[model samples]
Target: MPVTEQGLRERIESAIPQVYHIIVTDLSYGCGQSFDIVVVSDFFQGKSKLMRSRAVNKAVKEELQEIHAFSCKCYTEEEWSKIVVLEHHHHHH
Candidate 1:
């Protein structure tokens, strides 16, 4: 692929272009980063989504200070599974 314009790289970094369909959704729950992230980076190699998310959290461990709230949910084709089970029938008297 041709090299993208310098400005384009900056735009993508800021989530402006959003070229990639993936995102690191970090919900601090109306607070700051809360030391949490969804781990949507390419660093997820050789690791499960949960592990990837944990890695991100570990990286920002220092940021978690006196915060009673922190959560994270990692998702991606590499670690996500498709639900194919059919609905179960119910029999009641």
Candidate 2:
């Protein structure tokens, strides 16, 4: 069964309040329609992927029936923009 847009929206709102956005980027990644979810929140601090997953899993436990699979790419506002910009200018080939 396909997940209703309303159901997905409800799950995100209920489970993660501080979530800036929750999107199922890719739906057909593997066997089932696996979702590439991106969650932005400070609640992710000091938590490993497993831990975060567990927390999210716990929150959305009830919605599991509608979901096929999940792949989260969580990031904090501070943790995500820590990339360095070295002074090496090279245009694409």
Candidate 3:
């Protein structure tokens, strides 16, 4: 079943128990079809990109089949901090 945005968010949050923040963007041409999932957590601090993606894949295995396109952007707390700083500065400029 193609999941609603709220449903998708809930499942990811539930599966990743330690996830700090989740930003989900629907990028499907129409309806709740695809998503860009950005997961930020301290738990990912030492994990490889493959490891992080695998975790996400495992988390949403059921929803994956229904999604037309999906992308995962994983970041550790430290990485997210840097991004926040960069974005903040960019906005100020």
Name the lDDT value of residue 60 in candidate 2.
80
Off by over 4 Å in 2: 5-7, 29-32, 77-93
lDDT of every model, 2 decimals: 0.41, 0.67, 0.70
lDDT of 2: 0.67
Of 2 and 3, the candidate ranking higher by TM-score: 3
Off by over 4 Å in 3: 30-32, 77-93
- Model 3 gets an lDDT of 0.70
lDDT string for model 2 (1-93, tens) is 466544565567777785776765655644355666677776678776678888887788765655767677787755645576453557778
Best by TM-score: 3
lDDT of 3 at 62: 70
Q: What TM-score does candidate 1 reach?
A: 0.37
In order, how many clashes per candidate? 0, 0, 0
| lDDT for position 18 in model 1 | 35
User: How high is each candidate's TM-score?
Assistant: 0.37, 0.65, 0.69
Using TM-score, rank the candidates from best to worst.
3, 2, 1
Give the true-structure RMSD of model 1. Answer: 11.9
Tens digit of per-residue lDDT, candidate 1, span 16-90: 223233333334343343424332444555777667546644554533333344454444445543564353447
Q: What is the Cα-based lDDT of residue 71 in candidate 1?
A: 50
